[PDB]
Write a protein that binds this ligand. Sequence first.
Ligand SMILES: NCC(=O)NS(=O)(=O)OC[C@H]1O[C@@H](n2cnc3c(N)ncnc32)[C@H](O)[C@@H]1O
Ligand SMILES: NCC(=O)NS(=O)(=O)OC[C@H]1O[C@@H](n2cnc3c(N)ncnc32)[C@H](O)[C@@H]1O
Ligand SMILES: [Cl-]
Ligand SMILES: [Cl-]
Ligand code: NA
Ligand code: NA
Ligand SMILES: [Zn+2]
Lengths: 436, 398
Amino acid sequence: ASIIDTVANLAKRRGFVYQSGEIYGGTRSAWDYGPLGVELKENIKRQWWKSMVTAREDVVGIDTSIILPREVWVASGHVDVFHDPLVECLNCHRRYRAEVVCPDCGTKWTEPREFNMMLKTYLGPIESDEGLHYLRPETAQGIFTNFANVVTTARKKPPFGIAQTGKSFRNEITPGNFIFRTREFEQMEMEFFVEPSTAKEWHQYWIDTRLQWYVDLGIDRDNLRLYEHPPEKLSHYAERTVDIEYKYGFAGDPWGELEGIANRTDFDLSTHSKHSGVDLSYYDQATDTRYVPYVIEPAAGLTRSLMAFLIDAYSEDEAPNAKGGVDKRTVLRFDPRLAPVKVAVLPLSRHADLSPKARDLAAELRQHWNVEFDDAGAIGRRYRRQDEVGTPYCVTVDFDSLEDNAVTVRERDSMAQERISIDQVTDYLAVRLKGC
Amino acid sequence: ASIIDTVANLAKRRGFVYQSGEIYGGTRSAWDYGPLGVELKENIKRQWWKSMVTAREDVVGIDTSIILPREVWVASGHVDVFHDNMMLKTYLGPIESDEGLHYLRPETAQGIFTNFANVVTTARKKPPFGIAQTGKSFRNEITPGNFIFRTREFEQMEMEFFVEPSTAKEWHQYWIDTRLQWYVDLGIDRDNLRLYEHPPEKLSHYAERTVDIEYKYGFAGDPWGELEGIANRTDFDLSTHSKHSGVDLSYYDQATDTRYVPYVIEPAAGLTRSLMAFLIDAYSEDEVDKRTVLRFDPRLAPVKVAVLPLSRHADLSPKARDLAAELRQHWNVEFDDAGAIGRRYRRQDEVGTPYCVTVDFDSLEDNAVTVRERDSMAQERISIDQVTDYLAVRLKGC
Ligand SMILES: NCC(=O)NS(=O)(=O)OC[C@H]1O[C@@H](n2cnc3c(N)ncnc32)[C@H](O)[C@@H]1O
Ligand SMILES: NCC(=O)NS(=O)(=O)OC[C@H]1O[C@@H](n2cnc3c(N)ncnc32)[C@H](O)[C@@H]1O
Ligand SMILES: [Cl-]
Ligand SMILES: [Cl-]
Ligand code: NA
Ligand code: NA
Ligand SMILES: [Zn+2]
């Protein structure tokens, strides 16, 4: 039994993900994120925004509409170029994306039809070509069309970036393994505008910087690699593209795309200047020169990053048992900043004298962190339940706590325990959790 | 010139909002949020999530797809009743036909209801308890509203609170009062908030009683508008999805050997509509010398601290940038060395920054800075190695 399936099964059982519309028949192309999944996803998003926007003078944020004017995607080239070769089996009429045999009926086909990957919708009463709009296949175009607006209000000057997170939509012909490839997914994209002659050096800077970002948040460097797009795989907007790939563990090739980092040269600002008639070039007053910035674009996938962090954090080891034995303990070794639950408050038993001190403590901690309270069953089994979802620290309230006003604090990975006065537990965890 | 127009112009000039696709012709039915706008919007969302989910034992979170199976909106009654049809269509898969027809969600609630049983299982929850969610919804609004008030694409913050039916009415009043207090706690003048009971004609097809929180936006004519809806949806939603799907979404109370379909109390807020309310409410003018100030609660202000070197100098600028870097570990910070310092104070007051930190020549001798509070303009001198802690207690959130 593989590790991807094991992790996917853990995620479903503990409510990281549910298949969207399960009760009506669900598919792998649409997932919901449950109580633990939504916190993990938001924590990843928050760390991306802190690294990209909050911590950097040279990067500012934006949030643009999923639905832009139709002309946007004409100018961008997506209307004409964002399609795949699509053929239909003359026997069953199932569709697939490229002699040859059918993977469902076994037979050896129609002429390849170009199928645009963008999702359509209609705005206004007339359901016609006039009101046709596309759901955005990328968040980048909302940034480019606001480049001049941001330069103005933010008083920014190249080299500088504009970062954004949001939903994107693609009419994927097939679903992926687990949450890897969905029709609706969240992206974290930053467009870094630079003076053209520096573009290549800035490209290497961001490849390295994004790579280090995953390592800093706990992914084993050995499970990350770089992949340079060959000229055929390059997107119509790119001159050079390097993907960060993670060892997901698929059957066959265990590697898959995690984040794409493209040199989009001056393509995007140029075509929007032409089609819109609005000048999106930059004027460098320090040299009395005008130029169209080149763009370096780190474009990450939030849900695909969640899958990578989840798989990388999965682990199994041997841990002291209730009896003097050892067990195959399941542990998600999340960075404390990503863990969906920061602290578990665990009264030794459901005894009525432990509950007052314990519930009061969980309330104090909920002021700062997402907290779980569990008084059900044996304590060691509740420790395993928290380790299984990656909780960094468990706080146990026992009967000695009523006499000395102190609790036990258990560290997830080492399982070491230390006794801490209650009036210092908040500070004790704050330094070890490194974020709220 | 009205306050809405004045506020909207400030929002545009300082980059809180831009009209989406401005360069290709934009309308008020779609807006982008600029550097300051996205921070304010995220701060409101985060404060909503903290009050609803993180701080409450009895409420957990979820995030569900914008595009659900078509059957969801048949069962919910939106296909048949949601017209004045207001739902946006899209087509999934190669065959572009009714076979692949799906609807973009007009509300986020249905993603919660269809997962009710899933959440009870994995989260081990029992009524009374809630499930909260933030995300984009879509409606084919016939006309746009004033500024960002009514758009075809907007963010909602909805929580579905499942209760034993006999307690539903008491829980309805609890959440009306609780939600009202949430806006007050974050700085909105209570006098600009009121309650409105839907008459039977205005009731939605899923609701038995609905109370709206309204804000005095300042529109021409009737200055009040809907801010947040709070509905008693009884057992309508879980009942209809159990029927159409054949999956039992009722709750079995082991403690009483009774099975029932919970009633639902739903506080459903609009993220973008709250931003408009917070933005207007905070706008103010005072002193002569007149001054424009956004009196944001420090937790919502998009920029927490501005670092302001008195002048350009090889000894002041490094100390100032080093300080701005230390503060960027915790908060969104602006660094501004352009122009006279009083001009830079006004620039920050105009977007609601709670605190300005000035680095002057005395800072080189005593390693201390001046900290100016936005509203009072009072100044206090603080050692550099205590500025972070000094600001942390006054910002009340990071
Ligand atoms: N702006 C430049 C760009 O778009 N670039 S990229 O087209 O390569 O998508 C950027 C990232 O979005 C993620 N991603 C893309 N498509 C999907 C999908 N269908 N499901 C899940 N994640 C996806 C993935 O992580 C990918 O690396
Ligand atoms: N689930 C129950 C429900 O949906 N109820 S409600 O339909 O009333 O929308 C809930 C909230 O979403 C916000 N909202 C609604 N429509 C819009 C719009 N077009 N633009 C901006 N905000 C809007 C607004 O704040 C409203 O109170
Ligand atoms: Cl975090
Ligand atoms: Cl209006
Ligand atoms: Na920044
Ligand atoms: Na909670
Ligand atoms: Zn076939």
